[PDB]
């Protein structure tokens, strides 16, 4: 985070500002992934 520091705001660019950023990434090397589609879940246990 940066407190004041010259980073102006975008809505009211007069008051002091507190800008915060978060740099990251998520990466896949091999794609081991599977999907289990669950349909008719409204009657999961309260069905019949």
């Amino acid at each position: 985070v940066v407190n004041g520091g010259g980073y102006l705001n975008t809505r009211n660019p007069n008051v002091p500002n507190m800008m915060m950023t978060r740099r990251y990434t998520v990466e896949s090397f091999v794609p081991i992934i599977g999907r289990i589609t669950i349909k008719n879940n409204n009657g999961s246990v309260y069905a019949r």
Binding site: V2, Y7, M19, T21, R23
Partner: protein, 48 residues
């Protein structure tokens, strides 16, 4: 005979947060100690 010293053109250089923490990381560049010396050398050449 009158001698006046009025204003000259300013030398600006934006220092964003994402630019400094990348040039310090990858290319080991001091992002403010290289922008300030390339500001001073531009002004000192405009003298000459």
């Amino acid at each position: 005979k009158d001698v006046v010293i009025d204003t000259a053109q300013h030398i600006e250089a934006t220092v964003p947060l994402e630019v400094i923490q990348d040039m310090k990381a990858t290319y080991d560049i001091d992002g403010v100690a290289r922008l300030s010396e390339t500001m001073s050398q531009l002004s000192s050449q405009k003298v000459d």
